[PDB]
Write a protein that binds this ligand. Structure first.
Ligand SMILES: [Mg+2]
Ligand SMILES: [Zn+2]
Ligand SMILES: [Zn+2]
Ligand SMILES: [Zn+2]
Lengths: 772, 98, 65, 114, 168, 43, 84, 49, 266, 133, 196
């Protein structure tokens, strides 16, 4: 375990980490001293000879210098002591052990390391001061903060090793992760908080600041965008100047509760050609979200482009907020005089409701719920009223706090804090629990010696009536302390239990990987999965997509999909395509639209068999929605003029594309039937999104637009398949292990249940049948 | 009407470290548990005889300050006589993002 | 220990004001807030310097060598 | 320990000019002046004065990172006008403005009896 | 419980049902009870599902269970990961646990098994059984300090003198 | 120094939890995080 | 046993791992003063040289792709599609 | 200000830490768990002062 | 008179209250920055300790000696040692101070900035005199000694700026305000009921016209008129903090004009 | 290079729901009954109250970067009091001969409902919004 | 850290001119992030400050004792008596431009502690150094100029990445690596290599 499976190593370095808004996503600030110690052995070659000779001349003390010279002979020259450290004349093939320099690839790691993202390749940036500086958005994968965290640095020694780092594990590559098929890095804290503030309708920027904000973008075209307001006084909006960081071609649409194309509340999101049309940018848009601006950018433009976008969004936002400022005070916890009366009187009425159930229980009139003690039933009610109360009291304050409330502002952007935090701070802390139940009678028939015996009152069993702003009574203080201690105990324990779970998952899966036959096998060549994850696709290349066909009324489906060239009402109007007039009554063509519709109906039944509930949204490769969107801007699709497509062009075009969606290659029934199988689901989606009526009426695609959409689905699909060599074993273990690490009818669940599951525990804790 | 005893002062339920926490009745339970662990690692004058003793490691604060916000319990803890910090002018703000 | 020359926050010399402050309290019986203000210490950064000082040096002097 | 010398903030490095004027590629009649051993004190002052010049189309400055005392100033002027000349005039205007400010303070101070 | 079901008109509509919740397990018996859906009946005890409904159902229940533990915490792990774990425990023909007993007692390499938990008791047995480690596991090549047969090392690289002489 | 001379060790039902009986006798906040949490009492 | 070129069934596309290893290997060889099969258009970094050689498919290397049974399919870097 | 309460052994200060034990000579009744022949036990940890 | 104008409100040895009208906020600020950071001063920079029997550390004391304000009136006729031609220091570039103190008294013996003595030749220039603002005429209290407590040391004071060390900071706090009625809408006032009732009215409100609600927002409006207060530490007189500040910024700009001039040669 | 829409509307309502410097305005054309208008305006810059008669103009011109002054000598294509520049984002077919066009002036939204201007309005980044009275 | 479990390291140090400032000429010694406060619910930190601000002006000891009749309203009233805005906010001006901040900053004194963890006693780097005798592997700890541990969990990440050669290097070249001569008949390290 300790000298072979893990060992300490040379070319390693460790120090306190600190954040930096001025580092690029993929770089790492390396202290001069650390750079002056760590070395790379470079071979003397015609290409570097002169440079290398200079670093040798520079020596071990100057920054871009060197420590040793390795002759062909094998003996090491110490530049620190060699009498010939000056007059050292290099020879091709020798090695110069030179200092670590700006842009060298290095492995950066934050322990524990329950993730492949816990060890990523960064670009060196030699800097002053004794800390490792990292870009803030890269904080999340490592799980780092700057409260006193230290991080590890490993230096590759070979051209091969360096390539491995730069080509497989570099930070930009790691953005979209296979753990949850979504981005694992997003915009955080200052930049998240500032991004909401910047993008409100209210927010307008004067020329002076616009110029600085523009210049701050390192790839800015040099083009001053036309102000949204030209006289009286030229003024730009936040939305406008943020859109300069958003690259061209980037298309995004999101509807939040109550979003119209007129977005009255500045709800949801609409980014067209990498320009914001409406809505406020926050967590859902610019965070590590599934539908994310980041998810689309990585996928559409590249990992290197997306990594640049992080830096860009932050350089603008942070600069703006530096000058706008943002604070948080006690005034932000303070709630209205009447809101406080209204809160007090909310607790007051709940306090009586509880006494009423208590008086009812003492008079033996209470009637227990089937499968519960008369007492169990009572405590349930009490606990339920008191919580209903804490929340009401909370929701009262939350509403009374204006949009100027700095806390509300942080909660609104999603930068920090939630509802409960406002509630507990402003209004009421609430009921305290230990082992699920209220504070119990540690003393004979009472919680504390300040109480009378057989006191089931909220005040006796741990209900903290007061806000943190108001302060806690000694009794409230001690009960909160009991309840508080419980969490610290599990935080403490879980830590090692969770650790060992991770180990066992890893050790059981380690030897599993995808072979060149798309088969998932172990060190015995025993097949685990015939095809990776039953679909033969890489998880990073997958996105939640809606299978339209699945739901809706049988009539609504019909309207959407049916083409009947033999009926004057259900034909494609000659406005839809050029052949419209000559297409009516074509029996031969109708045979093809019958196949089309008949397949779509087949598919509907099938999908309804797979997803029994009728759930439409599933993670599948190739975002077809986006390809269409792009075809539309790429080809400047005129939603007026008729298409130059044939029914044969659409119908057969799709039929043909399908045969080109290759996962398995072998020439034989077994492997060919296998290929058909893997591709099934994706095709149902493909056929749903590319049916004739849809393509013409909805998408309004031209032949070239369509031809392009088809080629792109193909290309994307192919890129989407898993790579033989993928160590899917470890991946899967860590993809379950890492989340288990973040874990806090009544059935045994979470960490102790996962423990039960993995152990194939014979005598389980909550056995239960669910009888339908 | 049954009261046999009275509490001298409820703040006395707290130990040496928690007794330096200002308004601990206004903090979330563990934040208090954290401070009563950190203050043990806070620099200051540990004893006035520091200059006459040979100990492995000694950390002494140049200009210690008594706290502006204090506990009645600190009187007994000798804290204002031998402090662990300085009263800093603190802005809670978003600035350069550093 | 031993009065800071200059307030940390703004750097107004505060080194001279110590004995003078301690005097305005014993000899003049004056409350801390007036003495500070008499001495022209108006900004709270400057006020905190004197008001919150602990002159440990005086104990240190109590040891012989 | 990894702390840079304090004079590095103001004292020019070995073979390091105060100004380095490089031309902007992305835009016509635009330039980029890097000011070594300088901060906001001068940057924001110059930028604001170039803004007063009518023949100046674009002007902005940025301190790319706080560990280093240097700033990049980008100047774009109308065709025919030179950005170096634009910078020269704004520099001059500033001096002449400060010259009056001193004269005016001096006169007003001499009038006081305290 | 609320159940989404297709309506005559086609659209999926909420058609809630009465469901029973047990405090104990007896699969064999409760299944044969008149008035229930023996096609729908579920137990959290997948060990039972395995015993009564076969290993295939054992896999489906085992995944269902794993999935719940993650989603209960409000977390999302892509199917494939849980699927793989579930499959590995399955393949043998029963419920092979992620313990020193289960997986670590399979036909894999001896040094591999020894790197987790039983070390010396595994190497003695390895000796008296005259085991032969084919060194295909990642563990072995790590102990041996050789390039593991994983990703980058899953294939070999050769120079071709044909193509070499072609480019010049 | 003070808090070290008031420290309590408990070697080896639910010991880590803050008991009602700990009122006025032991500090409800002063306890370590991790392994020794709630097994190291402070008077 | 070695699968004939006419019976090869692995991807016609180069894997991430293959490409990373080819680039690593060439860069290593280039760095050990091996002959460069491309015009270095001022290039000096062996990885940027490697990238250039792979960009023009002037890398004289072959990927021996092993199958779980022990057999293999040999693929030239010239013939592998680089969609990465 | 030094408060005493430690020893000086070979020049380093040492603090005895209070050790917490269960009081002796104490009668305690406990239910012995579901799989057990014995349902309840009365224990007394008897020891001399 | 000409361009930007001053209107002094109050004066003393230690403070200058004034109004700066017909100026760019950028200019007002750049001056404010310079006054804090770039005006040269003389301050102790090397401390050679011969004897120290005190309760305080050699460097603890050393640190304080730098923070002791020294007469920097004629600072302009002293050279920065870096620019000077000697080996370390000399008269042309430094002021040598001496401090010998001893506990003769049974009572506590005090060490003051007055106890500093100049040993270097001053070239008859107003420099290196420990600034004494103290009523009793003692200046800064450096140390306290008991009986056999001796303190014998030597100080080398050098020309410097606040950028290198805050000891060469000639100014204390610089007060700076504009638009006491938020006419410019440069701040969005945080409030609970009324921002007018909740936020205290500035002193300077009296020196400006209240906005009068029955008027539209002046967007065209720009920031001119700055209410400032410059506080001196001693080294330089209050007026000269302002003047030298104006001059430093002027010189700083001239360097740029000159740099461009040398660049024109090639 | 020329005008695309011209009409005088009358404001029915002005709405600053939480917004301190901006307002959604509801107006209808005094000429055509079929014509209505929804629009976000910087009311801190150009104030608007209800029953105000306002000339609302479109026009595709009067491309590349933006220049600030010289406009003193340049022909200020504004005989109007408040001017905006935005993008056309949607073309809603609201039955019959009725159409509705959506305009975003950097977040400041606009919805114009009518019929006639089939031969005018287009899906262009270029669209100015001019308002007088 | 403050006395509220509100710990942190210095990210940067700014001079007085770069710092944001009150019109009164006051500047912070410390800038802490608003993002600390909400999730943490350390209300007493905010109160400590407000009370400390009053205390500093009033020259009276601010009683921050637990169970008392001191209210945030009480202290607020006292601060308004001193000329400051009751909830501790103060309008600040940006240090670089001098332009007023659109936000008003919660500003006042707070007792901060200096903790035993300083970067320079932590920072460590190695690249070939002392080795153990038995295992012939890098020695342990910063103290001994040891190398860091590329442990089991790190091996896993490398295996996940598919960094076959990067791993081999860490385990061999970068640590342990040795050469033996073995026999072809009995695969043992028996060989008497007199390689010379
Ligand atoms: Mg941390
Ligand atoms: Zn001060
Ligand atoms: Zn000299
Ligand atoms: Zn042999």
């Amino acid at each position: 375990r300790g000298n072979l499976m893990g060992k300490r190593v040379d070319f390693s370095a460790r120090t306190v980490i600190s954040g930096d808004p001025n580092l690029e996503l993929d770089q790492v600030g390396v202290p001069k001293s650390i750079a002056k110690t760590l070395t790379y052995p470079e071979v003397v070659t015609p290409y570097n000879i002169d440079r290398l000779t200079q670093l040798v001349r520079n020596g071990p003390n100057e920054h871009p210098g060197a420590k040793y010279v390795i002759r062909d002979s094998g003996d090491r020259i110490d530049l620190r002591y060699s009498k010939r450290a000056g007059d050292i004349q290099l020879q091709y093939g020798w090695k110069v052990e030179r200092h670590i320099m700006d842009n060298d690839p290095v492995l950066f790691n934050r322990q524990p390391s329950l993730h492949k993202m816990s060890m990523m390749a960064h670009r060196v940036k030699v800097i002053p001061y004794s800390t490792f500086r990292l870009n803030l958005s890269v904080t999340s994968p490592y799980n780092a903060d700057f409260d006193g965290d230290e991080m590890n640095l490993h230096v590759p020694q070979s051209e091969e090793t360096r390539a491995e780092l730069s080509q497989l594990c570099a930070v930009p590559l790691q953005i979209v992760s296979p753990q949850s098929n979504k981005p694992c890095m997003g915009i955080v804290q200052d930049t998240l908080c500032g991004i909401r503030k910047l993008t409100l309708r209210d927010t307008f920027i004067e020329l002076d600041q616009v110029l600085n904000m523009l210049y701050w973008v390192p790839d800015w075209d040099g083009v001053i965008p036309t102000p949204a307001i030209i006289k009286p006084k030229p003024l730009w909006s936040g939305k406008q100047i943020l859109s300069v960081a958003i690259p061209n071609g980037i298309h995004l649409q999101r509807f939040d509760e109550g979003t119209t194309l007129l977005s009255p509340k500045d709800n949801g999101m609409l980014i067209i050609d990498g320009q914001i049309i409406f809505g406020v940018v926050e967590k859902k848009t610019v965070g590590s979200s599934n539908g994310g601006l980041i998810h689309v950018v990585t996928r559409e433009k590249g990992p290197q482009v997306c990594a640049k976008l992080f830096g860009n969004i932050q350089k603008v936002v942070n600069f703006w907020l530096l000058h706008n400022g943002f604070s948080t005070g006690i005034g932000d916890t303070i709630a209205d005089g009447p809101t406080m009366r209204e809160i007090t009187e909310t607790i007051a009425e709940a306090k009586k409701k509880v006494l009423d159930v208590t008086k009812e229980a003492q008079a033996n009139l209470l009637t227990a719920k089937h499968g519960m003690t008369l007492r169990e039933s009572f405590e349930d009610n009490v606990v339920r009223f008191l919580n209903e109360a804490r929340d009401k009291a909370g929701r009262l304050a939350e509403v009374n706090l204006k949009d100027l409330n700095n806390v509300k502002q942080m909660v609104m952007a999603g930068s920090k804090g939630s509802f409960i935090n406002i509630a507990q701070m402003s209004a009421c802390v609430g009921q305290q629990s230990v082992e699920g139940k209220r504070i119990a009678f540690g003393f004979v028939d009472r919680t504390l010696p300040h109480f009378s015996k057989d006191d089931y009152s909220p005040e006796s069993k741990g209900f903290v009536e007061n806000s943190y702003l108001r302060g806690l009574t000694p009794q409230e203080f001690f009960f909160h302390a009991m309840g508080g201690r419980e969490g610290l105990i599990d935080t403490a324990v879980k830590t090692a239990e969770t650790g060992y779970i991770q180990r066992r998952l890893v050790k059981a899966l380690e030897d599993i990987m995808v072979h060149y036959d798309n088969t998932t096998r172990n060190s015995l060549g025993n097949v685990i999965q015939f095809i990776y994850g039953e679909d033969g696709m890489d998880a990073a290349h997958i996105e939640k997509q809606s299978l339209d066909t699945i739901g809706g009324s049988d009539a609504a489906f019909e309207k959407r999909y049916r083409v009947d060239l033999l009926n004057t009402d259900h034909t494609l109007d000659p406005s839809l395509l050029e052949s419209g007039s000559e297409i009516l009554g074509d029996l031969k063509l109708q045979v093809l639209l019958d196949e089309e519709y008949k397949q779509l109906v087949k598919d509907r039944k099938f999908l309804r068999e797979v997803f029994v509930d009728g759930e439409a949204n599933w993670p599948l490769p190739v975002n077809i929605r986006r390809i269409i969107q792009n075809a539309q801007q790429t080809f400047h699709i005129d939603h007026t003029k008729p298409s130059d497509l044939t029914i044969k062009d659409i119908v057969l075009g799709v039929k043909d594309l399908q045969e080109n969606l290759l996962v398995l290659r072998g020439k034989n029934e077994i492997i060919q039937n296998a290929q058909r199988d893997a591709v099934t689901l994706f095709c149902c989606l493909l056929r749903s999104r590319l049916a004739t009526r849809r393509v013409l009426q909805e998408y309004r695609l031209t032949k070239q637009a369509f031809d392009w959409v088809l080629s792109n689905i193909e290309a994307q699909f192919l890129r989407s398949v898993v790579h033989p060599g993928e160590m899917v074993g470890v991946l899967a273990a860590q993809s379950i292990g890492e989340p288990a690490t973040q874990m806090t009818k009544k059935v045994t669940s979470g960490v102790p249940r996962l423990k039960e599951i993995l152990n194939v525990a014979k005598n389980m804790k909550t056995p239960s049948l669910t009888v339908y | 009407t049954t009261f046999t005893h009275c509490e001298i002062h409820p703040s006395m339920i707290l130990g040496v470290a928690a007794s330096i926490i200002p308004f601990p009745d206004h903090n979330q339970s563990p934040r208090n548990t954290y401070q009563s662990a950190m203050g043990k690692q806070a620099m200051g004058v540990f004893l006035t005889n520091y200059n006459v003793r040979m100990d492995t490691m000694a950390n002494i604060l140049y200009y210690p300050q008594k706290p502006l916000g204090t506990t009645r319990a600190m009187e007994y803890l000798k804290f204002r006589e031998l402090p662990a910090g300085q009263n800093a002018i603190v802005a809670i703000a978003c600035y350069s993002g550093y | 220990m031993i009065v800071p020359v200059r307030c940390f926050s703004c750097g107004k010399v505060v080194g001279d004001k110590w004995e003078s402050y301690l005097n305005l309290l014993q000899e003049d019986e004056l409350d801390e807030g007036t003495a500070l203000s008499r001495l022209g210490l108006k900004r709270y950064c400057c006020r905190r310097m004197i008001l919150t000082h602990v002159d440990l040096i005086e104990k240190f002097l109590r040891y012989n060598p | 320990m990894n702390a840079p010398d304090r004079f590095e903030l103001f004292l020019l490095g070995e073979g390091e000019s105060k100004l380095k004027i490089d031309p902007d590629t992305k835009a016509p009649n635009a330039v980029v002046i890097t000011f070594e051993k300088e901060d906001h004190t001068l940057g924001n002052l110059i930028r604001a004065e170039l803004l007063n010049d009518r023949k100046v189309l674009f002007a902005a400055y940025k301190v790319e990172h706080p560990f280093f005392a240097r700033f990049k100033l980008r100047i774009q002027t109308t065709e025919g006008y030179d950005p170096k000349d634009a910078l020269k005039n704004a520099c001059n205007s500033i001096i002449n403005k400060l010259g009056a400010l001193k004269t005016n303070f001096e006169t007003e101070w001499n009038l006081q009896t305290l | 419980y609320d159940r989404k079901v297709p309506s005559p008109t086609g659209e999926y509509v909420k058609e809630p049902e009465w469901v029973l919740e047990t405090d104990g397990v007896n699969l064999s018996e409760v299944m044969t009870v008149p008035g229930i859906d023996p096609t729908r009946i579920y137990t959290n005890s997948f060990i039972d599902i395995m015993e009564v409904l076969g290993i295939e159902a054992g896999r489906a229940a085992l995944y269902k269970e794993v999935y719940n533990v993650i989603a209960s915490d409000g977390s999302y792990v892509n199917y494939r990961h849980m699927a793989l774990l579930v499959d590995v425990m399955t393949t043998q023909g029963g419920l092979t646990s992620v313990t020193r007993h289960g997986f670590n007692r399979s036909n894999t390499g001896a040094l591999m098994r020894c790197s987790f938990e039983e070390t010396v008791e595994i190497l003695f047995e390895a000796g008296a059984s005259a085991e032969l480690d084919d060194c295909r596991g990642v563990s072995e090549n790590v102990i041996l300090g050789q390039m593991a047969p994983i990703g980058t090392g899953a294939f070999d690289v050769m120079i071709d003198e044909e193509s070499l002489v072609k480019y010049m | 120094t003070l808090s070290h001379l008031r420290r309590t060790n408990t070697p080896i039902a639910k010991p880590r939890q803050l008991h009602n009986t700990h009122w006025g006798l032991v500090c409800p906040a002063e306890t370590p995080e991790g392994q020794a949490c709630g097994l190291v009492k402070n008077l | 046993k070695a699968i004939p070129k006419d019976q090869r069934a692995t991807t016609p596309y180069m894997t991430k791992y293959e490409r990373a290893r080819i680039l690593g290997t060439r860069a290593l060889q280039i760095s050990m003063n091996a002959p460069v099969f491309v015009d270095l258009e001022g290039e000096t970094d062996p990885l940027r040289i490697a990238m250039k050689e792979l960009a023009e498919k002037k890398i004289p290397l072959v990927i021996r792709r092993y199958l779980p049974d022990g057999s293999f399919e040999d693929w030239s870097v010239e013939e592998l599609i680089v969609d990465l | 200000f030094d408060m005493g309460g430690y020893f000086i052994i070979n020049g380093s200060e040492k603090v005895l830490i209070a050790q917490e034990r269960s009081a002796g000579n104490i009668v305690q009744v406990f239910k012995k768990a579901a799989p057990s022949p014995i349902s309840h036990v009365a224990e007394i940890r008897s020891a001399l002062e | 008179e000409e361009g930007p104008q001053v209107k002094i409100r109050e004066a003393s040895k230690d403070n200058v209250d004034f109004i700066l009208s017909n100026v760019d906020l950028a200019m007002a600020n750049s001056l404010r920055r310079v006054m804090i950071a770039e005006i040269p001063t003389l301050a102790i920079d090397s401390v050679e300790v011969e004897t120290n029997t005190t309760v305080l550390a050699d460097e603890f004391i050393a640190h304080r000696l730098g923070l002791i304000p020294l007469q920097s009136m004629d600072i302009e006729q002293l050279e920065y040692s870096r620019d000077c031609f000697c080996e370390d220091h000399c008269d042309k570039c430094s002021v040598v101070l001496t401090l010998q103190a001893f506990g003769e008294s049974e009572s506590t013996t005090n060490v003051y900035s007055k106890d500093l003595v100049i040993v270097s030749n001053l070239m008859g220039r107003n420099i290196g005199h420990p600034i004494i603002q103290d009523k009793e005429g003692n200046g800064v209290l450096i140390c306290k000694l008991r009986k056999g407590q001796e303190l014998k040391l030597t100080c080398v004071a050098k020309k410097g700026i606040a950028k290198e060390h805050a000891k060469w900071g000639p100014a204390a706090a610089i007060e700076f305000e504009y638009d006491p009625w938020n006419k410019l809408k440069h701040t969005d006032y945080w409030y609970e009921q009324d921002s007018a009732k909740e936020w205290p009215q500035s002193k300077n409100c009296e020196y400006e016209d209240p906005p009068n609600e029955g008027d539209p927002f002046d967007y065209k409006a720009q920031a001119d008129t700055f209410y400032m207060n410059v506080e001196s530490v001693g080294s330089i007189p209050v007026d000269q903090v302002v003047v030298r500040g104006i001059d430093t910024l002027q010189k700083k700009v001239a360097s740029i004009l000159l740099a461009l001039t040398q660049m024109d040669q090639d | 290079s020329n005008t695309l829409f011209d009409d005088i509307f009358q404001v029915s309502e002005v709405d600053p729901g939480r917004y301190n410097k901006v307002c959604r305005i509801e107006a209808a054309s005094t000429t055509q009954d079929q014509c209505k208008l929804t629009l976000d305006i910087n009311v801190e810059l150009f104030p608007v109250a209800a029953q105000d008669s306002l000339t609302v103009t479109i026009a595709s011109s009067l491309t590349r970067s933006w220049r600030p002054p010289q406009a003193g000598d340049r022909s200020l294509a504004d005989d109007y009091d408040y001017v905006m520049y935005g993008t056309a984002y949607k073309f809603e077919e609201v039955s019959k001969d009725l159409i509705a066009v959506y305009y975003s002036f950097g977040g400041l939204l606009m919805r114009l409902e009518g019929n006639y201007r089939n031969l005018n309005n287009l899906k262009q980044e270029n669209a100015y919004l001019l308002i007088r009275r | 850290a403050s006395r509220h479990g509100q710990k942190g390291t210095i990210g940067i140090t700014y001079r007085r001119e770069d710092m944001p400032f009150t019109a009164e000429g006051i500047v912070p010694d410390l800038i802490i992030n608003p993002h600390a406060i909400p999730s943490r619910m350390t209300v007493a930190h905010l109160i400590e400050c407000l009370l400390s601000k009053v205390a500093a002006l009033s020259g009276n000891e601010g009683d921050a004792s637990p169970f008392t009749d001191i209210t945030v309203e009480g202290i607020s009233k006292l601060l308004r008596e001193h000329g400051y805005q009751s909830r501790g906010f103060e309008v600040m001006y940006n240090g670089h431009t001098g332009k007023k901040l659109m936000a008003q900053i919660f500003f006042g004194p707070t007792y901060y502690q200096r903790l035993r963890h300083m970067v320079d006693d932590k920072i460590h780097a190695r690249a070939r150094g002392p080795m153990q005798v038995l295992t012939r592997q890098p020695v342990e700890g910063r103290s001994r100029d040891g190398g860091l541990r590329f442990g089991e969990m790190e091996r896993d990440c490398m295996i996940a990445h598919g960094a076959a050669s990067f791993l081999k290097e860490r385990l061999m070249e970068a640590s342990d690596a040795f050469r033996v001569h073995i026999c072809g008949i009995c695969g043992l390290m028996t060989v008497i290599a007199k390689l010379n």
